[PDB]
Amino acid sequence: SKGPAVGIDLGTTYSCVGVFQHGKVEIIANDQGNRTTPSYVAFTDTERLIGDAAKNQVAMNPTNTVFDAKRLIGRRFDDAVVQSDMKHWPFMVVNDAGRPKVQVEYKGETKSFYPEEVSSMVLTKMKEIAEAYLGKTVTNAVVTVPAYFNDSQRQATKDAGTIAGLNVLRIINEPTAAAIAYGLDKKVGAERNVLIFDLGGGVFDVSILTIEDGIFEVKSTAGDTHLGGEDFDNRMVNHFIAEFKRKHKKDISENKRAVRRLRTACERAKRTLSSSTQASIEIDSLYEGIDFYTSITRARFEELNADLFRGTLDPVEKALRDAKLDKSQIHDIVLVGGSTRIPKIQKLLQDFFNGKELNKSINPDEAVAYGAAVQAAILSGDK
Numbered sequence: 585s586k587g588p589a590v591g592i593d594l595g596t597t598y599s600c601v602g603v604f605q606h607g608k609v610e611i612i613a614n615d616q617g618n619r620t621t622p623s624y625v626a627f628t629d630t631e632r633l634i635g636d637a638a639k640n641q642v643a644m645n646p647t648n649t650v651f652d653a654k655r656l657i658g659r660r661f662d663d664a665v666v667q668s669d670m671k672h673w674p675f676m677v678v679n680d681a682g683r684p685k686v687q688v689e690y691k692g693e694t695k696s697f698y699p700e701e702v703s704s705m706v707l708t709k710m711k712e713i714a715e716a717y718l719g720k721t722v723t724n725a726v727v728t729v730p731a732y733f734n735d736s737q738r739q740a741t742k743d744a745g746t747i748a749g750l751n752v753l754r755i756i757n758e759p760t761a762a763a764i765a766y767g768l769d770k771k772v773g774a775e776r777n778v779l780i781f782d783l784g785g786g787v788f789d790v791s792i793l794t795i796e797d798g799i800f801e802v803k804s805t806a807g808d809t810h811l812g813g814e815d816f817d818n819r820m821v822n823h824f825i826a827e828f829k830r831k832h833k834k835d836i837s838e839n840k841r842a843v844r845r846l847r848t849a850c851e852r853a854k855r856t857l858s859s860s861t862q863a864s865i866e867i868d869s870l871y872e873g874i875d876f877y878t879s880i881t882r883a884r885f886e887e888l889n890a891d892l893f894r895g896t897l898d899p900v901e902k903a904l905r906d907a908k909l910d911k912s913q914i915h916d917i918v919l920v921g922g923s924t925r926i927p928k929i930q931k932l933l934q935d936f937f938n939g940k941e942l943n944k945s946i947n948p949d950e951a952v953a954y955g956a957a958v959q960a961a962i963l964s965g966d967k
């Protein structure tokens with residue numbers, strides 16, 4: 585009937601949904617007013633919390649708050665990747681006939697879900713948010729996936745959509761969606777090379793696309809599976825723990841809720857630092873009855889992650905090399921991921937590309953969703 589098709593960025597740490605309507609794309613904000621919602625699902629005695637409500641209680645419910653499902657989806661339990669990651673997740677992953685599965689306690693009873701089931705919960709929240717905005721039912725959808733996702737991971741993502749009551753029109757690659765967002769898919773009678781630099785919450789991807797006469801071709805990809813904004817937050821944490829230890833003589837490492845409450849403050853300050861040069865850290869009763877009041881400068885923040893930010897260029901060089909291109913041969917540089925909002929990273933990348941201008945007018949964390957929405961409208965036949 586009507587039901588606008590939506591574009592959904594099913595992210596590792598955050599997801600985003602947008603619709604194309606009347607020539608323009610609108611990225612839908614949630615009930616809390618955020619344009620992206622955490623890819624978190626929590627289980628308690630009384631309820632199943634999803635998104636912001638879920639993430640905002642993780643310090644209390646470590647064992648029953650699920651995240652990083654995108655790292656599990658489509659894989660086997662005996663998968664080396666699963667085995668490694670598994671070691672640092674506060675929730676349990678079990679082996680159900682070769683398939684990895686998350687084990688959580690809900691309403692007193694022990695329950696387990698397949699990665700696909702967790703993702704469908706997040707997708708339900710996105711569809712929900714979309715519907716709340718559109719004031720109409722949403723069925724059709726285009727969901728995005730990393731270019732390196734194999735048939736299994738891709739099917740598992742389609743499955744997650746089906747479970748959530750979404751008719752997935754197509755599963756397109758994330759880098760391809762970011763290009764479409766900026767319109768780099770328009771035919772110009774020439775072959776164009778685009779570099780997608782994607783730095784999100786916990787994954788770093790770099791892909792070189794070649795678009796000719798309308799068709800995309802992934803030339804090369806590179807990055808680091810365990811490099812993201814969360815790593816930057818941690819450096820700040822260690823910094824403040826040592827600060828507190830020095831100024832109060834009490835190490836707070838031991839207290840897991842104090843540490844996580846600090847981390848939450850650091851993530852927020854980090855965001856403020858992308859627009860301001862100083863940020864306040866106000867934490868009442870951080871350890872025992874000690875309030876932790878301090879501040880940090882962008883200069884110090886950059887100091888804390890120097891090597892990290894700098895190392896970002898290594899995967900870029902490799903990408904160029906594998907694609908068999910020189911810096912000069914790349915036509916467009918698109919910034920994707922919430923972490924690309926950091927000034928220093930934008931500087932460092934530009935300097936590397938000898939001054940070339942960065943594509944970044946569309947919020948990097950909303951770019952993929954933006955492109956998916958455009959593509960959804962096309963597939964639905966309304967654009």
Ligand SMILES: Nc1ncnc2c1ncn2[C@@H]1O[C@H](COP(=O)(O)OP(=O)(O)O)[C@@H](O)[C@H]1O
Nearest residue numbers: 595596597598784785813855858921922923949
């Ligand atoms: N203003 C900002 N400065 C730095 N990092 C930011 C900013 N806004 C968002 N982020 C970070 O971006 C990450 C979210 O990236 P996003 O693409 O939304 O997630 P993902 O792709 O991992 O699902 C988090 O680390 C968040 O702190």
Ligand SMILES: [Mg+2]
Nearest residue numbers: 595784921949
């Ligand atoms: Mg992202």
